[PDB]
Design a protein around this ligand. Structure first.
Ligand SMILES: [Cl-]
Ligand SMILES: [Cl-]
Lengths: 21, 29, 29, 21
């Protein structure tokens, strides 16, 4: 999930926005 | 600020800044 | 740190610290 | 919601925990 995508690997705007309400 | 490794509070900061008035869910598992 | 007025990033910081490994939802509306 | 409870008024542990997953 987010940690794998954005901490252990490099984040993106695309993915962050998937977690906005 | 978003296209890098963001961990713990740093990750939550970026969600907060990107999401703005919508807010967000933070589900680290 | 929790029994005070917590706004914006300050509120998100407290959710992060209280919730720990569970994470949280931040729904300001 | 949270902002009314914890920013415009004084927060509590009780209420913060209601927003933990
Ligand atoms: Cl911005
Ligand atoms: Cl603590």
């Amino acid at each position: 999930g987010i940690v794998e995508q954005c901490c252990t690997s490099i984040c993106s705007l695309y993915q962050l926005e998937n977690y906005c309400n | 600020f978003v296209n890098q490794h963001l961990c713990x509070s740093h990750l939550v900061e970026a969600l907060y800044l990107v999401c703005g008035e919508r807010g967000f869910f933070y589900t680290p598992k």
